[PDB]
């Protein structure tokens, strides 16, 4: 149902500091009165050693499903969009070009595209119109 | 003010300015769609080229 | 309405529905102030701006390319 | 007034002369800043040519762009320590 | 009333008219009046109707020429 | 002064601990694993990237000496 965030130790040992089960304060019932209503905290409540990871200011913890299920659903989705892409590519179902792609005179506008001399024609030329 | 129990909600008494403005903008859109469609239904749908008058 | 605690919290933006008693007097001064140097923006802009496509003739640029060649 | 570069090379001085080594160090610094000035002038020509030529900039500004791309690697401050402390011919 | 492609513009006339590079093709001759008409008429859809239709038809003929070329290219590719 | 902050004992205990984590740190296998990653593994990875490409990237005014677009088209049928 409701599970703790990751990287939360199940035990710790810090001398005489009180040892308590980590409570993610984001999940507290918001219809109860608190001394700190915004933070859902009463005065003098002991803090976990990593309470900054288990309070309102920590990143929100989404727990509708487990992370693996969400990661499995996430991969399942984009896997379909890759199978759809791969079926068409290998089978070659995309249409062919209806016309020869555009070509241009003047050796494919080589001079207009920053070509210096005949040695650098195909370096800068667009597709060449062989039909004068 | 007083609340009337059980009485159903009839068609609202919307101010005439709100209704007429709404029907002018909607009628303006529909007119434009029909006006553009009449002169461009062949050009839009690939049934005739723009220069083939 | 509510309690805005306006006794000591007076931010530059006003603090919970603040309109001073002499707001009409100040509004005219600010409108005069806004209008006065809004023309100053126009006067500066017309003097300083220029057309970067008309600063050099095309004949001047042909010499540049050949000389730098 | 406008001071001038005391053209003095590391190759023609004794480094034990404190004032002569100071001049060669200054002389090399001032010649590199002038090349930076020249590069900026060439880039000014490129920008004006590009704006005016419009779609003709590839052809009209070809040699200006070629010269700027050649001068850019070495028309920058290199310091005097590199050439002071190194003899290229050895 | 454009039946076939017009005569090609010279290189200098393309530079004089500042024709876009992608549109320096067989139909650049018909583009010069249209861009001249477009600027005068604020590019409004109703102003330069005839000059726009003529240039659109020219690109249609240039396109159909490229349709014919690809059929020609495939024939050489099929028979080689 | 007038003690304008309502001191919280649990806040003070928590804050005092966060300042004094060094007292309870043990150089166990878990600590050794993180020390190796942060101070040996990662610096080595950047160490080998820095000297591999030391002077091997002349990228100032780098020119194009090869065409980008294909001249001829070949259908797939
Ligand atoms: C490089 C990799 C990313 C580096 C990550 C650095 C660690 C995170 C640093 C931010 C610490 C979190 C923080 O500052 O406060 C939490 C904040 C709240 O966000 P949240 O609770 O989700 O918003 C709900 C609003 N009702 O959470 C945040 O809004 C933090 C916003 C993200 C910080 C930058 C992360 C960019 C990640 C880009 C890659 C994403 C995948 C592609
Ligand atoms: C707190 C304020 C701190 C006070 C210290 C800061 C001092 C600012 C520096 C003073 C400079 C004096 C000055 O304005 O010189 C006038 C200058 C003329 O120089 P000129 O060579 O002729 O212009 C070349 C522009 N191509 O003319 C100019 O070029 C200035 C024009 C620049 C316009 C930039 C606008 C920036 C935003 C302006 C917002 C404020 C102006 C509006 C005033 C209130 C309007 C209601
Ligand atoms: C507007 C200036 C007058 C345009 C010339 C008169 C005209 O016929 O155009 C009216 C125009 C709708 O006509 P339209 O189909 O766009 O093209 C011209 C059709 N002979 O009307 C409009 O374009 C109205 C556009 C919204 C205002
Ligand atoms: C450079 C010299 C490298 C010396 C490495 C010292 C390693 C070290 O001190 O590890 C800590 C260890 C105490 O153990 P601890 O940290 O509490 O965690 C162990 C839990 N089983 O410490 C010990 O195990 C006690 C032995 C300490 C020896 C220190 C030698 C100092 C002499 C050289 C100084 C330089
Ligand atoms: C490009 C540079 C722009 C410079 C000028 C921009 C306008 C300056 C506004 C100053 C007045 C103001 O916003 O600060 C004063 C207002 C006060 O709140 P109030 O609305 O009066 O309500 C009052 C009721 N309280 C008291 C509950 C708020 O905000 C605050 O203290 C809110 C805290 C955030 C500080 C915002 C600082 C913004 C600085 C921008 C950083 C680049
Ligand atoms: C916050 C903590 C940071 C600490 C400092 C970080 C900088 C580390 C620099 C690593 C350099 C490195 O990896 O250099 C690699 C070198 C030699 O490489 P090679 O493969 O033997 O020879 C290279 C020739 N090749 C490429 C042809 C195979 O290794 C050493 O002899 C490093 C000695 C000191 C570290 C042990």
From TrEMBL, chain A:
The keyword Transmembrane helix applies. GO terms for molecular function: oxidoreductase activity. It comes from the Eukaryota. The keyword Plastid does not apply. Keywords: Membrane, Oxidoreductase, Transmembrane, Transmembrane helix, Ubiquinone. It is an enzyme of class 1 (oxidoreductase). Its EC number is 1.6.5.3. GO terms for cellular component: mitochondrion. The chain crosses the membrane at residues 73-94. This is NIAM (ASHI) subunit of mitochondrial NADH:ubiquinone oxidoreductase (Complex I). It comes from Komagataella pastoris. The gene is niam. The chain holds residues 25 to 156 of 156 of the full protein.
UniProtKB/TrEMBL annotation, chain C:
The keyword Oxidoreductase applies. Keywords: Oxidoreductase, Ubiquinone. It comes from the Eukaryota. Its EC number is 1.6.5.3. The keyword Oxidoreductase applies. One of its GO terms (molecular function) is oxidoreductase activity. This is NUUM subunit of mitochondrial NADH:ubiquinone oxidoreductase (Complex I). It comes from Komagataella pastoris. The gene is nuum.
From TrEMBL, chain D:
Its main location: mitochondrion. One of its GO terms (molecular function) is oxidoreductase activity. The keyword Mitochondrion applies. Keywords: Electron transport, Membrane, Mitochondrion, Mitochondrion inner membrane, Oxidoreductase, Respiratory chain, Transport, Ubiquinone. It is found in: Mitochondrion inner membrane. It is an enzyme of class 1 (oxidoreductase). One of its GO terms (cellular component) is mitochondrial inner membrane. It is a peripheral membrane protein. Its EC number is 1.6.5.3. This is NIDM (PDSW) subunit of mitochondrial NADH:ubiquinone oxidoreductase (Complex I). It comes from Komagataella pastoris (Yeast). The lineage of its organism: Eukaryota, Fungi, Dikarya, Ascomycota, Saccharomycotina. The gene is nidm.
From TrEMBL, chain F:
It comes from the Eukaryota. The keyword Transmembrane helix applies. This is NB5M (B15) subunit of mitochondrial NADH:ubiquinone oxidoreductase (Complex I). The chain crosses the membrane at residues 35-53. GO terms for molecular function: oxidoreductase activity. The gene is nb5M. Its EC number is 1.6.5.3. The lineage of its organism: Eukaryota, Fungi, Dikarya, Ascomycota, Saccharomycotina. Keywords: Membrane, Oxidoreductase, Transmembrane, Transmembrane helix, Ubiquinone.
């Amino acid at each position: 149902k409701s599970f703790l965030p990751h990287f939360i130790p199940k035990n710790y040992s810090y001398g005489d500091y009180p040892r308590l089960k980590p409570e993610n304060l984001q999940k507290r019932d918001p219809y109860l009165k608190y001394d700190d209503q915004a933070n859902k905290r009463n005065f003098n409540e002991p803090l976990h050693p990593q309470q900054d990871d288990l309070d309102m200011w920590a990143p929100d913890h989404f727990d509708f499903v487990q992370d693996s299920i969400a990661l499995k659903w996430f991969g399942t989705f984009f896997g379909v969009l890759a199978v759809f892409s791969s079926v068409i590519y290998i089978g070659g179902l995309y249409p062919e070009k209806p016309a020869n792609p555009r070509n241009y005179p003047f050796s494919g506008l080589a001079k207009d595209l920053g070509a210096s001399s005949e040695e650098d024609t195909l370096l800068y030329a667009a597709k060449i119109d062989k039909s004068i | 003010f007083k609340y009337v129990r059980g009485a159903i909600v009839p068609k609202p008494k919307v101010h005439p300015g709100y209704v007429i403005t709404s029907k002018f903008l909607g009628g303006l859109m529909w007119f434009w769609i029909f006006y553009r469609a009449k002169q461009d239904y062949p050009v839009w749908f690939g049934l005739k080229h723009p220069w083939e008058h | 309405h509510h309690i805005h605690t306006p006794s000591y919290i007076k931010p530059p933006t006003g603090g919970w529905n603040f309109t001073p008693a002499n707001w009409k007097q100040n509004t005219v001064l600010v409108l005069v102030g806004f209008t006065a140097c809004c023309v100053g923006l126009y006067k500066l802009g017309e003097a300083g701006s220029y057309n970067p496509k008309l600063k050099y003739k095309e004949e001047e640029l042909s010499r540049w390319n050949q000389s730098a060649k | 007034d406008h001071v001038r570069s005391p053209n003095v090379s590391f190759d023609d001085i004794d480094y034990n002369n404190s004032q002569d080594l100071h001049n060669a160090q200054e002389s090399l610094l001032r010649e590199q800043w002038i090349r930076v000035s020249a590069l900026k002038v060439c880039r000014k020509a490129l920008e004006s040519c590009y704006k005016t030529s419009g779609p003709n900039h590839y052809e009209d500004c070809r040699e200006i762009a070629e010269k700027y791309l050649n001068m850019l690697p070495d028309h920058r401050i290199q310091g005097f320590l590199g050439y002071q402390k190194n003899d290229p011919s050895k | 009333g454009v039946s076939e492609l017009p005569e090609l513009l010279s290189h200098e006339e393309m530079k004089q008219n500042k024709i876009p590079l992608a549109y320096r093709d067989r139909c650049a001759r018909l583009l010069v009046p249209l861009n001249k008409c477009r600027k005068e008429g604020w590019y409004m859809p109703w102003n330069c109707v005839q000059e726009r239709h003529d240039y659109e038809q020219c690109q249609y003929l240039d396109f159909k020429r490229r349709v014919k070329e690809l059929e020609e290219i495939k024939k050489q590719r099929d028979a080689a | 002064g007038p003690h304008l902050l309502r001191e919280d004992a649990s806040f003070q205990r928590y804050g005092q601990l966060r300042d004094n984590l060094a007292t309870y740190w043990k150089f166990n296998r878990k600590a050794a694993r993180n020390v190796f990653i942060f101070l040996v593994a990662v610096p080595a990875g950047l160490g080998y990237l820095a000297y591999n490409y030391e002077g091997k990237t002349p990228f100032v005014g780098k020119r194009r000496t090869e065409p980008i677009f294909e001249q001829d088209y070949v259908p797939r049928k």
